[PDB]
Amino acid sequence: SIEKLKAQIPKMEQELKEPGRFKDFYQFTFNFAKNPGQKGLDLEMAIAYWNLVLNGRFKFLDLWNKFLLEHHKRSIPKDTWNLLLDFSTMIADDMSNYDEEGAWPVLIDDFVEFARPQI
Amino acid sequence: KCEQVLIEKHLEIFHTEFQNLLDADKNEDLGRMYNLVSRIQDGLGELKKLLETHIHNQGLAAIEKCGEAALNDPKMYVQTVLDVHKKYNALVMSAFNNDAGFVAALDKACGRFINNNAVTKMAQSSSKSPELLARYCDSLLKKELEDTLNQVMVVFKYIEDKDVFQKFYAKMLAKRLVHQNSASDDAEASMISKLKQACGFEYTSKLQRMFQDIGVSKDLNEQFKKHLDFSIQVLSSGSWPFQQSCTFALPSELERSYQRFTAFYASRHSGRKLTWLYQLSKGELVTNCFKNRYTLQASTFQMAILLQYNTEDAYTVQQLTDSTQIKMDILAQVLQILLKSKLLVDENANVDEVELKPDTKLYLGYKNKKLRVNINVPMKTEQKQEQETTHKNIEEDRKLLIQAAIVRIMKMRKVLKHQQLLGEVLTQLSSRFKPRVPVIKKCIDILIEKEYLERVDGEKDTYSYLA
Amino acid sequence: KKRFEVKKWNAVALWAWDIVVDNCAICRNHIMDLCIECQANQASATSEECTVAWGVCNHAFHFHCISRWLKTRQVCPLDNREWEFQKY
Ligand SMILES: [Zn+2]
Numbered sequence A: 001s002i003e004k005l006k007a008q009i010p011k012m013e014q015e016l017k018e019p020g021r022f023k024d025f026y027q028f029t030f031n032f033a034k035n036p037g038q039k040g041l042d043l044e045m046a047i048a049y050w051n052l053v054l055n056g057r058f059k060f061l062d063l064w065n066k067f068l069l070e071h072h073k074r075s076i077p078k079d080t081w082n083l084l085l086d087f088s089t090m091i092a093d094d095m096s097n098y099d100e101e102g103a104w105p106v107l108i109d110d111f112v113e114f115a116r117p118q119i
Numbered sequence B: 001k002c003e004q005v006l007i008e009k010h011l012e013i014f015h016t017e018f019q020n021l022l023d024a025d026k027n028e029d030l031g032r033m034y035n036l037v038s039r040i041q042d043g044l045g046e047l048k049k050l051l052e053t054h055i056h057n058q059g060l061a062a063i064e065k066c067g068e069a070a071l072n073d074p075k076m077y078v079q080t081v082l083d084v085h086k087k088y089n090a091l092v093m094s095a096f097n098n099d100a101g102f103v104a105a106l107d108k109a110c111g112r113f114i115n116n117n118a119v120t121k122m123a124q125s126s127s128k129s130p131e132l133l134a135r136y137c138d139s140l141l142k143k144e145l146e147d148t149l150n151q152v153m154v155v156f157k158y159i160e161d162k163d164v165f166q167k168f169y170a171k172m173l174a175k176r177l178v179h180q181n182s183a184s185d186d187a188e189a190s191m192i193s194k195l196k197q198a199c200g201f202e203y204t205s206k207l208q209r210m211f212q213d214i215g216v217s218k219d220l221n222e223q224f225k226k227h228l229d230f231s232i233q234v235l236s237s238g239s240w241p242f243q244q245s246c247t248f249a250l251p252s253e254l255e256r257s258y259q260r261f262t263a264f265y266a267s268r269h270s271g272r273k274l275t276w277l278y279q280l281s282k283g284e285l286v287t288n289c290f291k292n293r294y295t296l297q298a299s300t301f302q303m304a305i306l307l308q309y310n311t312e313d314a315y316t317v318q319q320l321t322d323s324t325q326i327k328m329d330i331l332a333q334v335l336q337i338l339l340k341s342k343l344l345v346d347e348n349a350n351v352d353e354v355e356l357k358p359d360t361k362l363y364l365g366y367k368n369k370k371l372r373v374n375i376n377v378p379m380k381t382e383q384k385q386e387q388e389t390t391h392k393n394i395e396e397d398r399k400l401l402i403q404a405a406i407v408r409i410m411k412m413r414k415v416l417k418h419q420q421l422l423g424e425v426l427t428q429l430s431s432r433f434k435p436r437v438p439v440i441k442k443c444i445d446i447l448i449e450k451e452y453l454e455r456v457d458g459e460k461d462t463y464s465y466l467a
Numbered sequence C: 001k002k003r004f005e006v007k008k009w010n011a012v013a014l015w016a017w018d019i020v021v022d023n024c025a026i027c028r029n030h031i032m033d034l035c036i037e038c039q040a041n042q043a044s045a046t047s048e049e050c051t052v053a054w055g056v057c058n059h060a061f062h063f064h065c066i067s068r069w070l071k072t073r074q075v076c077p078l079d080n081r082e083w084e085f086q087k088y
């Protein structure tokens, strides 16, 4: 019914924000927002979806957004998007638990190195 | 008891003397010291570390003494390293009775001060030493001497970056094989055997392929001269580091040979053609209109430019460009080379400093003491660009080898952690070079992007292989 | 105005198969141009490494194309024998 569609928004907005299902939604967003003809998402489109999806959840979204504009003028691969949410979940305010020799992409570690002095 | 009273109670004083005995060469005093201290149990460690520190400091001082000159003079650097190395080797053999600890300390110190030095800091890279060693080897080989080769070989094992040296030596050997200026084939064979003992079989097999190509070219040339002064060398493109030439217009006088040989190849081999190279091609020309008969050795570009003056008089740079079809940089370099020798010259001191723009000329004097004249000289800035290109190729090849090593590792083991792949990669390539983790890490993301490795969902730190 | 004559000439030339030097066997694009999968995606780190790969049989192929071919088959397409990398 139309009333069911109207009432759908509160409940599944409440339910989607829970962990687990939100992981599946975040994974599906990459394929949904990507044209079939290219494996890499465009920079502007990726920034727009980062603003739209990770609003408030990411502690340093405003700082992370200003990056990869004057330095990384290339498309974003699929692996960085997958690990960005885990990096945001594991990160702390002091950023002292990060490791440069771990399983993180070359973009996350360079961003951490760039943002370390300013805090 | 006595050894405790006489030697143990004054060991500190002995140490204070040791450095002094290192400042002034006294082999007998050092030998007596070693003999007396050898009685004391685990008393040689301080002497070993002091000797290592002294050797490192002396080597650093010796390298820094000849600064600003060894960058473009490899021979001075090799001699400075070799004299110090032989002096300390003789000292260890004589005074210290060739002890294992002393030779180990000497090797550690040599490896420390050879890779890193003032020259390395000036060059901002650690690959300068293998390049200098390769340059010295090429200078020695190109046109009683095996001792220097053995010294170079025994020094080379201390180099932690052998790929650069191998690539530079292969390139210089190819250049020395293309142009027939070699001191002796026996020296080349001895060097090949020494590298076979030192390096792997594949690196020497590449050079064996080069020699086989040279022999095939010689046989083809003799067959051509039997069938018929023109000499040509045919080499495979996939086994030599040369690059394709730019656009160039064949001189008319040289066209006659070009049509004759090519068809011959079409008669012998079907399905292949020839891509001629002009930067590595040289020749001789004879002029009889001077005061005395003259013969000049030139290159293809220089010969073409000169043969453009036959039947005309003064030319200007726009013409030499649209007729001969030579790029602006190469044409400018060739014109500068021709100028600095007074053959084409409004009378300007700064021929070296000149700015050449399209405006201008043969000078008919040209006296010289010698009847025959070599005007073919290396370009001003070709060597630096060639070195940079070789270095870039080395880094790209390093990345490719790491990407292939990870792939070949991830086929014996279906699943692997991140701290067990890196150690395997490091220990597998440790013979040639020691890659950095970000270099090894940047290759993993490339492989994952190309659908070669997959991160399992449950663990982000454990890769797997997919078909 | 002068007279010049040449006494001798020395030249160096390289030989290669004409069937594949002009264009790759796997992909009909130019050998100096980017590969088929490197053209649709042109904003990635894999588009700055598409170079030429040579073998023992003096066969020139794109590095990505030959790497993909050597994932399920271990023979050079044109001569039908084991392929070994020689230079890049
Ligand atoms: Zn490609």
Ligand SMILES: [Zn+2]
Pocket: C024, C026, C027, C035, C036, C061, C062, C065
């Ligand atoms: Zn291709």
Ligand SMILES: [Zn+2]
Pocket: C055, C057, C059, C076, C077, C078, C079, C080, C081
């Ligand atoms: Zn083949």
